[PDB]
Design an enzyme around this catalytic site. Structure first.
Site, short mmCIF file in Angstrom:
data_model
loop_
_atom_site.label_atom_id
_atom_site.label_comp_id
_atom_site.label_asym_id
_atom_site.label_seq_id
_atom_site.Cartn_x
_atom_site.Cartn_y
_atom_site.Cartn_z
CD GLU A 77 -0.62 -6.84 5.03
OE1 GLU A 77 -0.34 -7.05 3.83
OE2 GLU A 77 -0.75 -5.70 5.52
CG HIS B 22 -3.20 -4.24 3.42
ND1 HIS B 22 -2.14 -3.76 4.16
CD2 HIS B 22 -3.91 -3.16 3.02
CE1 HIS B 22 -2.21 -2.44 4.22
NE2 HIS B 22 -3.28 -2.05 3.53
CB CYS C 121 -0.99 -0.08 1.15
SG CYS C 121 -2.40 1.04 0.96
#
Ligand code: GTF
Ligand code: GTF
Ligand code: GTF
Ligand code: ADP
Ligand code: ADP
Ligand code: ADP
Ligand code: NA
Ligand code: NA
Ligand code: NA
Lengths: 535, 535, 535
Positions: free
Chosen positions: A509, A507, A379
């Site tokens: 993750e 994202h 990001c």
């Protein structure tokens, strides 16, 4: 069958690891073939953590449906395959907001609106909405038993236990059993007093989970059982462990899932924890070691990057690479220069908002790009990578985001509604949240790693790559590796004159798990290992 | 004029070191010239510790007046020069015993005898009896706030505070502020909940003493203050220290004694802690090290030898020697022989009752006498030294105590009533408790060390040296160093042809302090270092 | 000077008369020349009682500023001359609504929004806003100490006491001391337990107000004092009385105002309760008696008409007329006819919403008009009087309100936006709340009674007299006695061929006090007395 509920409360202190204990128990039950879910009831007044700062309560987790949630839902998704949504997390704020809405527009028909029944009814309705359909629903109550903020949640779940029946409902209470160095024993007194506090609210716990920096011995568990109306076998030791992936095994070894399956009359096979045994095995048997620098602005609270840190460790598992994560303040790079980026096998710049420490991240992106150090930008980490390349390669002096410098000549990052070129010319819900299909470009590093033309990742950002200035950055050698939507928004960029340089708007993750890993993080850590070997 | 009271309570857990904290505060107040005392209210049902086992209870402390008291009164006498008596320690047992006897007699005139007022009145009468005549009285309440056992004490001191007035009464509450490794925070929540528990009994604490493994920072103290109705300057950090002698200084540096002197309108000079500063200095700066073996039958609980372990440490302070105290089970000497007594620079055999492990101690006294290893025998430790010398030098086969072998041929140790010779011939309250004037023998090693014809030490024993068999042991070269009373009881024996061999019937450890040390323990540790040099 | 706060809490049960006790104490303090106000903190989730039904929590009181409030503000205005506004009443709903508003629009700058400090801060801010400027502020906390719903209010006022200082803050706790007929004594145990509950939340009460059906004797007050850390003189007996106007005298006779003035260092003269003594004297010395029928739809809960019932009694005081108020269900008039309106010296039709029981009220208005029985109509009572006259005198068959029959031919009562005539022809915030200037018509009964051209009364209604159909009702002999505003809205009507027939749109009961009475109610009761004499 009738849905069963395990209400999970905390006593004595917070920071007990209640989410991880609930998630670990959920993992055992799922491994017995049960349909299990988890939900988090947070006593904060925030309608959701979408407003909340990363350096307060930690990372804002994002579900597929685009809900902004407590980071505990990250633990839930990393422990069970049941996907989380808006209905797995709600706050006191959400409950009061809903009751207030209904009240102001006459739903209560002139009634006095009360904590009981109106607030408690609203809580019970959301628990049932998130739970019904599943074999076992774990309901984690935020806050500490004995505090004001959790009382409506506790009263609500007390009512649910009576209504649904105790054949379908269990109370599981976590306490601290602290070690006193001076006396060389662990202390049950806080557990004894916390259980009396819980009872005084109307809840008899069925199961006690004793958090300590060591196993709670048989004598101490017998004493807790004696004073708390709990069978000795329902007093469980949950010691501090070096790896949370061991917790399902530790709980299973004390018969916790057997006790729950007996209470709920669930006839299911013994838990097969092979998948967790494998993750533990991998973790304990690395072949090599890397140091990866995470360069961000929230490093004072590591929990700001919970999912990123776990994703890096999962990257390690899949490569049998032990990852030493070095948290580096991007403001220290502004002060002390690129001296503090030395001895790094790879550099990750994670997400963030606000200009504070961003020039450090841009400098960091420059350092990684020029010195051929593997780089992953997430990001803001993608923005700073674009700014870096725009400035120092495409010769766009002072190129920036409108978030940081609104009136800059080269806004290479800006809101769609703000898009303009260097001469101020223009084209003829800005917030992107949750799962978005992204098209990967042929002959991109990521199109190989993901090994598919399309991927689904989760967004939490409004500041997009300016398409009006992109073509100039593309001419200068920057590759667009991924796009999405009608507006062909840039999702992934790559610097191909570099062993491994990837930055994404989403994202990744949030879709990484210890068991399944993540194509992008696995690739990033592989590149870190390869760099380390070349030195 | 009006005696002031500080009621000291404990919350969250026991083993907070509440007696040491009270004794430490009393030391600061005594160092301001104030007349101060401390008393211990124990919630156990034992009328006194006289019956209680060393292995379970820890050491039975003996006061001048011969009261058998809690180990804490040893801490009190080591921190302040006010002498303790029966009035400084009482139990629930003692209180119910008092009231039951008044009731059976008819003192209550056919009244219903009730916890309030009759038990609470008996508690208050004993507190006033111990306290009145002092500037400041510290009243330590045993048990933990929230438990049943201390409630009558807490109700009693609540009433006293109102009756006497809050101008002359303070509530000082100790809590645990535990450290959570996973969050790196110390936690105030247990303190918050413990103060609410104390309030629920009717007591608003004035001062909070926060026990932790580290200093409680300003933010945490401010948070405790905010939730507990306590001024921030009355929230005190009492961290784990390497030496309890530092605690007076640490409390003074936080203005605790200033707060108390202000609340009680006491105009007195600043605390002169120079003597404690000297003790702390001495401890941190030893010039040489010794290993002293303490060979006994209760080493499974070191607190069984609390005052002996402290007296050895104080011996070290006065000679600037570090004392490595090795606790050796006397039964291991019986089992594995005298090999486990090697690498010792000195040997202490402390007090005890019952035959178990005594043969090991006799063998230990032999080893120490024959190998010229410094020896201090205390009570039983003197008995085994006499028995050794009787057996192996005075040629009295199987010489023993009547306590162990009642019908032995040579009862060299026996009750005064049991005194007989080897042929069974006899002469034509047995328990000795508290202060006894003892006459020392000219040219004896102890006449030197004490520098007086008469000394006062404290007894807790029944079995005496048999004077009918003594002359025979004296002929074989054993020297009587001290005696007491009309019955010329043997108090101290010495073995000449030894660098340092003393054994005494009394408990010299009960008159040892860190500031003034003890002649005997000073001598003993001095000999231990002199022995260690010669190796 | 610094504003002083008296926080007034309730224990054991609700319905203690906490508003009346707080109002009575305020009356004593005002009679000592002090500037005093009162505020009500309600734990209901309703943003205000504007939604709430009369037959739930009772009458909706209206302040001058048009705030819809708890009926307790009616007690406040009837006991003290300090005029109430929006800032003298707020709910949990209002507090959460405000914090949620601020949170969603970023006022908390990414903070976790918590019960403490954010909810408690919002409560404290509103207490300070309503209080600062006054000598003494009484803060009445709704709900019962020990319940969930009041905890944020209790935590907020605990914080305020510490911040402001105990020199400026007092805790006054009401409890029930119930009589046990079986044992013939009043019981202090609930007081003892309620005080421990209050302390467990962090509040030591300074003053105990003991509610009982009889005086709490000295022994019981001494026992409460003994167990509650409260001086005996601060334990006050507040027995059940036949007249609430006696309560200021009963509290003053026990030195309550003296105790408060001492604690706050307020040097003010002894309370002159002459005005209350006069009201009591008047009440106890009536010359004649009347029976007035209150014909409404909420009579099952008399508190629905609290201010009307008090206004009728005040009407009695000013005429020395004892008023027997007969509550009559308007639905019983629909069923059983005008038989149940017999033996009434006057008829009052009070305010209300919904068609249920309205035809009964219209029938009742008819009966009173035709039989020359004194009539007072309030709001709905005016509508039914207009409908009655429209139907039975002006020959407008089925004439009604659009609230009840939307599509009726003659909507003589309708919203301004709905105004139409019998042929459906029209003209070329509907809710009226709070004080409105009303112009009185010359040679009207009310222009005499009020003895002024203009008056200020308070509204709570949306359904107005239809001006398009009014002229026809005026032709038929109905007099408009009062008007207001640009739209010349009809405020008062009279039937002049009748000894006393008045109906108003406003709620005159909201400006009536025991001390000052009310011109309209005094006149109504006078007419009732005159009617009674003529029979
Ligand atoms: N509800 C209770 C429970 C116990 N006790 C009393 O608690 C006393 C023991 O106190 P400790 O040793 O501090 O407590 P522990 O339970 O062993 O807890 P830890 O594991 O923290 O050491 C007994 O005399 C008692 F009497 F048993 C009590 O008075 N009321
Ligand atoms: N009586 C109280 C006090 C507090 N809280 C709530 O307690 C919450 C904070 O919980 P934490 O962080 O676990 O507690 P801490 O006080 O910081 O204690 P520690 O020093 O052990 O960390 C707030 O939302 C609250 F709202 F403040 C509460 O609900 N009722
Ligand atoms: N905190 C307390 C207070 C009292 N008591 C015990 O309470 C007992 C008396 O019980 P009662 O007669 O029912 O209580 P009362 O106080 O007289 O209250 P009421 O005015 O309702 O009659 C004593 O034995 C005691 F012992 F005094 C107690 O055990 N703990
Ligand atoms: N078994 C465990 N061993 C070590 N740390 C743990 C364990 N379980 C949880 N933790 C850690 O404890 C911390 C506190 O967890 P948190 O979710 O904040 O607790 P709570 O839900 O009680 O507030 C987290 O950093 C978490 O990773
Ligand atoms: N500040 C301190 N630092 C380290 N150890 C301490 C401290 N205070 C006390 N201790 C030790 O902790 C123990 C206190 O236990 P104890 O005195 O029985 O508890 P309590 O006073 O609560 O009854 C003893 O072993 C004592 O030496
Ligand atoms: N001294 C008193 N004697 C008799 N009735 C009283 C007295 N004080 C109040 N009341 C009545 O008690 C009832 C309950 O009052 P309320 O305001 O509901 O109490 P609370 O504020 O505790 O909820 C009301 O009808 C009130 O008029
Ligand atoms: Na214990
Ligand atoms: Na905290
Ligand atoms: Na009684």
């Amino acid at each position: 069958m009738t849905t069963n509920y395990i209400f999970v409360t905390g006593g004595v202190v917070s920071s007990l690891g209640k989410g991880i204990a609930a998630a670990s128990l959920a993992a055992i039950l799922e491994a017995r073939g049960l349909n299990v879910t988890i939900m988090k009831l947070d006593p904060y007044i925030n309608v959701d953590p979408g407003t909340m700062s990363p350096i307060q309560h930690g990372e804002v987790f994002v579900t597929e449906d685009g809900a902004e949630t407590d980071l505990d839902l990250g633990h839930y998704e990393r422990f069970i395959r049941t996907k989380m949504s808006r209905r797995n997390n709600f706050t006191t704020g959400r409950i009061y907001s809903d009751v207030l809405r209904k009240e102001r527009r006459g739903d209560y028909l002139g009634a006095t609106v009360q904590v009981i029944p109106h607030i408690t009814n609203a809580i019970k309705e959301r628990v049932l909405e998130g739970g019904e359909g599943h074999d076992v629903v774990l309901v984690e109550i935020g806050g500490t038993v004995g505090d004001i903020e959790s009382l409506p949640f506790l009263e609500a779940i007390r009512q649910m236990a009576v209504e649904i029946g105790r054949e379908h409902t269990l109370f599981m209470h976590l306490t601290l059993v602290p070690y006193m160095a001076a006396s060389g024993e662990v202390k049950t007194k806080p557990t004894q007093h916390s259980v009396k506090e819980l009872l005084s609210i109307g809840i008899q716990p069925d199961i006690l989970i004793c958090r300590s920096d060591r196993a709670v011995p048989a004598n101490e568990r017998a004493k807790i059982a004696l004073f708390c109306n709990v069978p000795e076998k329902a007093v469980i030791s949950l010691k501090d462990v070096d790896s949370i992936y061991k917790i399902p095994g530790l709980l299973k070894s004390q018969g916790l899932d057997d006790y729950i399956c007996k209470r709920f009359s669930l006839n299911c096979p013994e838990a097969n924890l092979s998948e967790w045994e494998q993750v533990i095995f991998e973790e304990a048997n690395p072949v090599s070691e890397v140091t990866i620098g995470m360069v961000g602005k929230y490093i004072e609270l590591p929990d700001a990057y919970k999912s990123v840190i776990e994703a890096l460790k999962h990257g390690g598992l899949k490569n049998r690479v032990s990852v030493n994560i070095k948290l580096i303040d991007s403001q220290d790079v502004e002060t002390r220069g690129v001296e503090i980026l030395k001895g790094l096998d790879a550099i990750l710049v994670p997400g963030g908002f606000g200009y504070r420490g961003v020039e450090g991240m841009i400098t960091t992106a420059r350092f990684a790009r020029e010195n051929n150090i593997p780089y992953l930008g997430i990001c803001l980490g993608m923005q700073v990578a674009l700014i870096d390349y725009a400035r120092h390669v495409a010769n766009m002096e002072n190129a920036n985001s409108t978030e940081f410098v609104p009136d800059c000549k080269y806004p290479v990052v800006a809101l769609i509604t703000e898009w303009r070129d260097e001469n101020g010319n223009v084209e003829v819900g800005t917030m992107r949240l949750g799962a978005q299909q992204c098209q990967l470009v042929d002959d991109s590093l990521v199109r190989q790693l993901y090994n598919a033309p399309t991927i689904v990742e989760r967004h939490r950002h409004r500041y997009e790559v300016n398409n009006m200035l992109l073509k100039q950055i593309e001419d200068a050698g920057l590759r667009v590796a991924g796009r999405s939507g009608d507006d062909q928004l840039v999702e992934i960029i790559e610097v191909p004159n570099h062993p491994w340089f990837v930055a994404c708007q989403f994202h990744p993750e949030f879709t990484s798990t210890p068991r399944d890993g993540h194509p992008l993080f696995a690739g990033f850590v592989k590149a870190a290992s390869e760099f380390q070997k070349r030195q």
